Ligand binder design. Structure first.
Ligand code: CL
Lengths: 82, 80, 81, 80, 81
């Protein structure tokens, strides 16, 4: 899994029916790093540090084994909680 | 998933039957970046910025759990 | 599979329910390399060198074909054989 | 999917039984780039530019969901 | 699939039971390249150039669709530079 930060919500799109209403977020490992897009399975806001899963796990994490995702946020990271 | 841009249509006449008639597009993260090829499941043209999915999800995104794809366009993006 | 070292525990109180109670660990191929996170399926401590599996094998290794993992620690490496 | 060129046939006499008799070819994104190996599901020769799929799609592309491939040639690109 | 050279055996005494008794080998694309670990399904020795498969194919390649592997040696390369 990857540690990434939420930059912004991906709204400016028209996409496929096989994807539902779960939000898409633009994420990166840090500012300036290459951007990716993840399905938000938790409920995140810009600036949140999030745990991201790829591969097959990303699909069922997004809510279905049939979900079109290869990157899904499955947790919010507590930077300071120990 | 990754945002990419469509450079051009990929022409491959000799290809396996499992691919069917789905259009294949050459895509890149940006001009000059490594070229990859994606199945277009939306209907795109050169210059379009597109949302692409890989892994297992690219197959069913292309229209079947058995489809031979590891990269599929699942959306067009305006603002890039 | 990758050879990585455990740096520390990753705390995510708000994570999806399918993760159960599995511990998550911050791992890297060496200090300074990009950090990743793996589910601990062995019982590891910081400083341990660990064998990590990704792809679909990470899921069942973490305890279920339905488990949300793409990186799972499946062994501790005895570096001084 | 990636665009790659066939360099040569990969000869591996001692390989697992699951591989059958499918040809294996050494491929690269261009000369001098890191070499990889793909199962040839099309019928290629050295010099061919080819379309290759990875991930789980490579297996069924090679002919079976149980086939041991993570990289399969699924087309010949008309521009060589 | 990758062409790699076998460097040495990977000793992991504390590893998940699903691994069985399959040998694990340290492999790299060339000396000095990043080390990975593959399950040996052929029977290899150090110095061998080997064909390695990853992704989901590595599992059944290692003996079972349930096997915890994302890198499996599935062939020995005849005469390799
Ligand atoms: Cl994969």
């Amino acid at each position: 899994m990857k540690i990434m930060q939420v930059e912004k919500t991906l709204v400016s799109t028209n996409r496929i029916a096989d994807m539902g209403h779960k939000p898409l977020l633009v994420v990166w490992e840090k500012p300036g790093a290459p951007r990716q897009v993840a399905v938000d399975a938790i409920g995140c806001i810009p600036g949140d540090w999030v745990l991201c899963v790829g591969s097959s796990a990303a699909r069922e994490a997004a809510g279905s084994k049939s979900y079109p995702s290869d990157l899904t946020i499955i947790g919010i990271i507590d930077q300071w909680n120990g």
